């Protein structure tokens, strides 16, 4: 189909909050092979963020019910595995689009850092549910993509830049929640916040700096 017709159908699905439609439309746009523009990139990010986010919220509820329990724990377990499968399929979709299309097509450093941050996020989502020896490999995949995006954003991107600040926010979340390293998470969010104050689309940047310090207040409490 037309790429413009797919994009405008995706914009329609957002106003209707039909995020499965939006992701399906945006997935077809990505599969065409061309580098996604900033608008198309944000529509794809917003789409899958809502699709996997619905399963993440459902998983936390059904998983917590399963542990905080005999017969009832059986169905709660079976229901979580069903949601976990849905979440695994969604995450494998985003990582496949990043591996075969988005990251290889990234010309600018901006387009890069964004898609590696995407890759680290959706491996972190897989690490939230993974268990056993499979969890160890998933965790290292998230840190690898997170680190690569961090070193590139340090070289090119300004400290007050949204995606540079947004990557530091998610990377610090990875250290606190996945690796359980609060001092590393607090350190990463502190220098990122402090380097942004050194420089001082300002509205987008100052929102993330508030979120970074918001996490610092929480983690040190």
């Amino acid at each position: 189909m037309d790429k413009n017709e797919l994009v405008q159908k995706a914009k329609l699905a957002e106003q209707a909050e039909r995020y499965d439609d939006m992701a399906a439309c945006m997935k077809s746009v990505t599969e065409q092979g061309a580098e996604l523009s900033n608008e198309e990139r944000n529509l794809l990010s917003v789409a899958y963020k809502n699709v996997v986010g619905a399963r993440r919220s459902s998983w936390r509820v059904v998983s917590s019910i399963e542990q905080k329990t005999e017969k009832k724990q059986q169905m709660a377990r079976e229901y979580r595995e069903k949601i976990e499968t849905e979440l695994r399929d969604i995450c494998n979709d985003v990582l496949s689009l990043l591996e075969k299309f988005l990251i290889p097509n990234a010309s600018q450093a901006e387009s890069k850092v964004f898609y590696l941050k995407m890759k680290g996020d959706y491996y972190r989502y897989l690490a939230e549910v993974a268990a056993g020896d499979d969890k160890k490999g998933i965790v290292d995949q998230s840190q690898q993509a997170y680190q690569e995006a961090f070193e590139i954003s340090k070289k090119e991107m300004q400290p007050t830049h949204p995606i540079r600040l947004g990557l530091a926010l998610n990377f610090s979340v990875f250290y606190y929640e996945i690796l359980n390293s609060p001092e590393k998470a607090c350190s990463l969010a502190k220098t990122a916040f402090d380097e942004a104050i050194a420089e001082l689309s300002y509205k987008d940047s100052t929102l993330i700096m508030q979120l970074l310090r918001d996490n610092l207040t929480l983690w040190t409490s």
């Binding site: 947004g166 926010l169 998610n170 929102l207 993330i208 929480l218």
Partner: peptide, 7 residues
């Protein structure tokens, strides 16, 4: 409520 939202 820790990671990044899309506003």
């Amino acid at each position: 409520r820790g990671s990044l939202p899309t506003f």
